[PDB]
């Protein structure tokens, strides 16, 4: 309860600079591509999709 009322002080006044700069900082941070993990994850995604399509059907 104390939390849910700790939010009672209104929002700050906005300006393009800060938020635009943060979502800009979402720019290049290192083209760190990891083929092993993405491949393992695509494999498990295929597997989950396959087992789900099997279950939600006679199959």
């Amino acid at each position: 309860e104390l939390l849910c009322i700790m939010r009672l002080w209104g929002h700050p006044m906005l300006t393009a600079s800060q938020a635009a700069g943060k979502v800009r900082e979402s720019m290049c941070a290192g083209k760190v591509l990891d083929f092993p993990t993405i491949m393992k994850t695509l494999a498990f995604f295929h597997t989950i999709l396959i087992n789900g399509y099997r279950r939600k059907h006679h199959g």
Partner: peptide, 26 residues
């Protein structure tokens, strides 16, 4: 020449192992 054939086998297995360890990580 059947020994040349086993060396062919060694060639293939070494190739697979090396290229695997190669393409494994970025």
């Amino acid at each position: 020449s059947q020994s040349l054939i086993q060396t062919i086998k060694n060639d293939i297995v070494g190739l697979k192992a090396g290229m695997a360890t190669l393409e494994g990580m970025i």
